[PDB]
Amino acid sequence: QCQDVVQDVPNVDVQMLELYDRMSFKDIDGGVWKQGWNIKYDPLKYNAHHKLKVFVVPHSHNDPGWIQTFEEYYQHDTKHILSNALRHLHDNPEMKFIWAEISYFARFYHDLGENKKLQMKSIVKNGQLEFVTGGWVMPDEANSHWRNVLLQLTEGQTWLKQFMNVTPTASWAIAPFGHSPTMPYILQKSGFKNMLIQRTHYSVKKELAQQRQLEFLWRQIWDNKGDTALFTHMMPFYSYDIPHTCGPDPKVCCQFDFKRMGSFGLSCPWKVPPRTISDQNVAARSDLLVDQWKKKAELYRTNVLLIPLGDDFRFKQNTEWDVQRVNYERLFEHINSQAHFNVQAQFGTLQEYFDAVHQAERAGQAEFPTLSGDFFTYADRSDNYWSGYYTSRPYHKRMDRVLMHYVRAAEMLSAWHSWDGMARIEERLEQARRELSLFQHHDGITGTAKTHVVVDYEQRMQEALKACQMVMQQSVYRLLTKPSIYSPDFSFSYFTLDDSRWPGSGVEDSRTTIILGEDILPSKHVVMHNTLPHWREQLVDFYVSSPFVSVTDLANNPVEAQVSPVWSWHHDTLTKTIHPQGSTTKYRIIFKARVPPMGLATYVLTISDSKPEHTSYASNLLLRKNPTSLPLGQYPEDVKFGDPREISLRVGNGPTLAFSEQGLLKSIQLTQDSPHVPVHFKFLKYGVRSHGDRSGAYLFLPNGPASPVELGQPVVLVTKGKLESSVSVGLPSVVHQTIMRGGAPEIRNLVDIGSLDNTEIVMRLETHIDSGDIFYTDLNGLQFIKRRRLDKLPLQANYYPIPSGMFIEDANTRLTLLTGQPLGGSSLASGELEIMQDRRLASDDERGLGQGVLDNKPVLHIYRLVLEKVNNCVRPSKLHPAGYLTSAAHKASQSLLDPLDKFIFAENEWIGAQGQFGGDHPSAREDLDVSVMRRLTKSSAKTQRVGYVLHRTNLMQCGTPEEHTQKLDVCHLLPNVARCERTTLTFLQNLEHLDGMVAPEVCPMETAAYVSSHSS
Ligand SMILES: [Zn+2]
């Protein structure tokens, strides 16, 4: 019986939106705890019968790229940290250490000799070395898509299970810049029992600490019953470094970072150095330290205290291991033997801490509050809100989403078969998963790494895209060739991928033209793949070398097509205008492909000597003063010219869109009769402050509200076709395109911020929707959370991640903007939405990156814009912290994130070609997705296993009967099923053996994983 995620407002002790509405956020000087208060404790709280149990947990934060690349850090730091951890833990049985980043650990362990592997396995098995989280990385939580958070978690944990025989159940996330409830969502469905977070707004830490609500059961915002809850520990202070982890006074705690005495090149900024512990000072030093611990303990409810002991790339040299270990051992020996402290302190691991906390809870010592909400937008001090990284390096943010889809499609397409090892399918998929997983790091997708590190991530992702293409095209060839003809060369490219939106028109000329001609090749097969588990139609386009091309399906049924020119925009450095040029030798052909669920469909493009019966030609109108001619080769319609003017377009029976004379949307009319609803796109710019703190890769510190971009008299290109029309305009730094295909328009911005230093370009929508101070943004592509604009916070605090969409609404009307890339955005006034396109910042923002953001490159951002009437929708009540998409907005998001894949057959003739794959696949209800399909076994396994992650979203009920679909049972998608299990989302633990080998569908907002096993 599925929980209702709409109509029941959960009762939680802390609801972060409500807390935000009540909190004052005053930034007062709290004393040595600058953002807190002077903590007081009663010395008599702890006594012989009630001691404070202190776990000092050594750690080393290892960034998989940040100011050096992964490999540079591995060579210069991490391999030494791990080698010396292995030696020192081996030699010191009571010493402990936690490790989070499995990308580094796997890199290290595979290079170890067998003797050392065995030693390493032993210190893990005996609990000295403990993995925390066990993902490939410690991912960003703002920009990352939940699918990639799960991918990287699975990549690390699958490695750990295979090589270390452990599966962490405690998560450690000390570094991401703000925290998302998507993490406890995924972790709780992946076996976890506990998680730790750190980077939350200093005001939130103060507020929760005052109420001893820093440990809480974190449930999802829609979860009325609480089954999603995951115990969460929030660290209370400003950093995870040693000065901010022993207690509230960093001037004292820094004295207990024994790497800071000088020979290591480190010191304490509070000007009191550590001193080596001796018999003559250990009582005074213990008094100071235990006092810090007892103050920290006042912020929490049990008598078990967590004291992290670590910092970035710590525990590298042997002398550092010694200096920390020996000094802490001297303190523990003293403290634990002095009854008056009533403390027992020891090195521990994270799991040991949580185990002891829950023993205290079970003993009735504490009850923990429940919490829902998120922890964005983080500020670590004053007005320094970390909303810049929601946009920084947007090229790679978009690339993340492209690769996300490519990985899913490559894993799904190749899962249908078992492949010989010679095919290198598993090799290529592992590479692709690992490079995408690496980029989920909190300096990867966030855009907060040095320029050469961003290049390394991009190069890795490019190799991952090539790997996905290889696997996908080999799979299509196999799936659509008569078996007794199939004759693969696993190194050959049978197909090339054609992607219209990455890197994108104006970004890279990467797309192959299908070259047809009477004297070379009459026709070409193309194949579309649909990774979604429902039948799908989508227009697809290809470049062709003639306008006289017609399309057939493989029953030779004509398919209606539209040919349009190939337009490319040029920054004309002679005329100082931005204007489009059309090709005279290549053309776009567009047609509707209809593709089975999780399936493939083949079409044929054929040249003819003149206009074919079922192909139409778009008209083109270039609006500008001072036009010049625009020849288009054989294209049969001459370009028309006019002065700038307002224009209106309608494709099919879809909305009618009206545009200003600058080529920007001004209104949407949903139907013939209905009103022209004002919806106005505008581009604006934010600058940087000339006094005080400067924006950089992390921080957004605008110098006031944005100023409109001066547009001049831009050139507007209108293409009008039966299947697709568009309005494109060359604005300064953005070629802005509105594309209409009969439903909600697609927006594409080719953003080139050029050399505009200290500028952030924002795209705003202005409407007269009476949204007030409310808007909705998504978290990791998984859920939409209610936001409230707070004028008591500065502008940048009202920016939130827009990882896949945002909307505003009133009682009657909603405007949703779906994105194909994570970007930052807000609603800074009633009726507005805005989303940042790019930012170019000359200054460093003091968070360690040591550079601004001056490596911009053109990026094609894509969106869908859905205006809808919502007065008939069953929406959550006014107090509910969630919102939900409509069917149309969800499909529009899927059209961006998981479009059809397009394959062009590379050779002249495809012998044995088949017309379709997957026609018998069930077409599941529109809210269900097969987020992952992954064969889990190599071909030598007698029992093959295939893993599926199913995700059901929740779409609002708005009165559309919309029904009859088939049940999707993933366990029967492959034949000869012998067992069906429900598993954790990482596939690593079987949770239920399923009757009848039937994988039941999941409830709204739930995600489940199943593994089918097959005997043949
Ligand atoms: Zn980090």
Please give the distance, rounded to the nearest whole angstrom, from the Cα atom of residue 958 to the centre of ligand 1. Answer: 44
Q: What six digits make up the tokens of 440?
A: 């989920």
Which residue bears the tokens 């070379």? 520
328, β-bridge pairs: none
| Burial classification of residue 897, based on how many CB atoms lie within 10 Å of its CB (0-12 exposed, 13-18 middle, 19 or more buried) | buried
Residue 738: what residue type?
Answer: T
What contacts 149, CB < 8 A, 6 or more positions away?
A: 135, 139, 141, 182, 183, 186, 440, 780
**SS3 for 414?**
helix
The strand pairing partners of 496, in sequence order, are 904
CA of 63 to the centre of ligand 1 (A): 5
Domains of the chain: 1-382 (3.20.110.10), 383-493 (1.20.1270.50), 494-618+899-920 (2.60.40.1180), 619-898 (2.70.98.30), 921-1016 (2.60.40.1360)
Q: 194: part of which helix (H) or strand (E)?
A: strand 194-197
Cα 689 to averaged position of ligand 1 atoms, centre (Å): 27
- Residue pointed to by tokens 């490079």: 435
User: Within 13 A of 619's CA, how many CA atoms are on the CB side?
Assistant: 6
C-alpha 600 – ligand 1 centre gap (Å)? 42
**Is residue 142 a contact partner of residue 354, using CB atoms and an 8 Å limit?**
no
**Ligand 1 centroid to residue 312 C-alpha, Å:** 7
Which of 480, 514, 517, 509 is CA-nearest to residue 496?
514
**Which backbone phi and psi does 463 adopt, to 5 degrees?**
-65, -35
Q: How far apart are the CA of 176 and the centre of ligand 1, in A?
A: 7
Spacing, Cα 389 to ligand 1 middle (Å): 14
Peptide bond into 228 cis (omega under 30): no
Give the C-alpha separation, 258 to 324, whole Å.
Answer: 5
Tell me the three state secondary structure of residue 30: coil
Between the CA of 216 and the centroid of ligand 1 the distance, in Å, is 24
Q: How far is the CA of 133 from the centre of ligand 1 (A)?
A: 15
Q: Is 166 exposed, middle or buried (0-12, 13-18, 19+ CB in 10 A)?
A: middle
Q: Please tell me the distance between residue 269's alpha carbon and the centre of ligand 1 in angstroms.
A: 21
Measured in degrees and rounded to the nearest 5, phi and psi for residue 475 equal -70, -45
CA 147 to centroid of ligand 1, rounded, Å? 21
Written in H, E and C, the secondary structure of 773-806 is CEEEEEECCCEEEEEECCCCCCHHHHCEEECCEE
What token pair was written down for 211?
């109420």
Going from the Cα of 307 to the center of ligand 1, the distance in angstroms, rounded, reads 19
Across-strand partners of 596? none
Using alpha carbons, list the distances in angstroms from residue 550 to 368, 556, 566, 740, 870. 66, 11, 17, 22, 41
CA–centroid distance, residue 64 to ligand 1 (Å): 8
Whether 890 contacts 913, CB under 8 Å: no
Report how far ligand 1's centroid is from the alpha carbon of 316 (Å): 16
Q: Dihedral of CA 505/507/510/515: which sign?
A: positive
Write the DSSP string, 124-148. HHTTSEEESS--SS-B-SSS--HHH
Q: DSSP 3-state helix, strand, coil percentages of the chain (rounded to 5)?
A: 25, 30, 45
Q: Distance between CA atoms of 234 and 596, rounded to whole angstroms?
A: 46
Q: Which residues of 799-831 are buried (b: 16+ CB within 10 A; e: fewer)?
A: bbbbbbbbbbbbeebbbbbbbbbbbbbbbbebb
Q: How far is the CA of 848 from the centre of ligand 1 (A)?
A: 10
What is the Rg, in whole angstroms, of the alpha carbon atoms belonging to the chain?
Answer: 29
Rounded Cα distance between 189 and 230, Å, is 10
Task: Give the 3-state secondary structure of residue 123.
Answer: helix
Residue 209: partners with Cβ closer than 8 Å, 6 or more residues away: 36, 236, 299
| Cα gap 403→396, rounded to integer Å | 10
Crossing angle of helices 425-439 and 451-479, in 10° steps, is 150
For 32, residues 6+ apart whose C-beta sits below 8 A from its C-beta are 38, 248, 249, 250, 251, 252
CA of residue 175 to ligand 1 center, whole Å? 5
3-state secondary structure of 394: helix
CA angle 400, 403, 409 (to 5 degrees): 145
Half-sphere exposure at residue 385, Cβ-oriented, CA atoms within 13 angstroms:
21
Collapsing DSSP states into helix, strand and coil, what is residue 866? strand
**Is there a cis peptide before residue 503, judged by omega within 30 degrees of 0?**
yes
> Ligand 1 centroid vs 61 CA: distance in angstroms?
6
Measured in Å, residue 98 CA sits from the centre of ligand 1 at 15
| Residues 6 or more apart in contact with residue 273 via CB below 8 angstroms | 255, 260, 261, 262, 267
User: 868: closest CA among 738, 958, 782?
Assistant: 958
Tell me how far apart the alpha carbons of residues 95 and 349 are, in angstroms, rounded to a whole number: 10
Place of tokens 């007005």: 383
List the one residue out of 798, 796, 141 whose CA is nearest residue 442.
141
Cα–Cα distances (Å) from 588 to 540, 583, 618, in that order, read: 10, 10, 10
Contact 614, 703 (CB under 8 A): no
Residue 437, helix vs strand vs coil: helix
CA distance 290 to 427: 52
Neighbour tally for 324: CB within 10 Å: 25
CA 458–ligand 1 middle distance (angstroms): 19
Structure determined by: X-ray
Q: Residue 404 Cα, ligand 1 centroid: separation in angstroms?
A: 22
CA 884 to ligand 1 centroid distance, Å:
33
> In sequence order, what are the beta bridge partners of 537?
594
Q: Are 199 and 177 in contact (CB under 8 A)?
A: yes
How far, in Å, from the CA of 103 to the mean position of ligand 1? 14
Residue 140's contacts (CB-CB under 8 Å, 6 or more residues apart) are: 176, 177, 440, 441, 442, 444, 445, 446
